[PDB]
Design a protein around this ligand. Sequence first.
Ligand SMILES: [Mg+2]
Lengths: 57, 58
Amino acid sequence: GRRKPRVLFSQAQVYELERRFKQQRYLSAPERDQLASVLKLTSTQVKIWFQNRRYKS
Amino acid sequence: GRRKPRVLFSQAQVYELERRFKQQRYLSAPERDQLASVLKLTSTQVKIWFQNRRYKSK
DNA sequence: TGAAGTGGGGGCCTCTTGA
DNA sequence: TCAAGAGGCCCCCACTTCA
Ligand SMILES: [Mg+2]
């Protein structure tokens, strides 16, 4: 049936995620929530981005 | 069918567990493994004892 | 009695998918 | 492409269960 499409993170969102990754490979529960607010993404999305980022690297 | 029995912890083991609990309500994996080794219990039993002790503390 | 089971949070890691 | 699915394994709290 119809399903929700994956939406790519913008250049700005990716830049900030990367900028933060350069300072911390792992984020605590509070930090994820905060960054998710700054990026306008969900806590989970930030959590998974870091997870895939640690894996990719 | 027959299933493994629940074995109680000795007075000495519980005494040491209650001693550590008065020092820390929670333990890290290294702390849980070192205590398990000392008491002759697995790390899961220790983990589960602190979990239960906390619930009962409520 | 009281350690252990059930089940519902989250989490990290690892590999793979497919609009 | 690349965020997300999903198996494998961990810690926590609530609330029982029954040798
Ligand atoms: Mg796409």
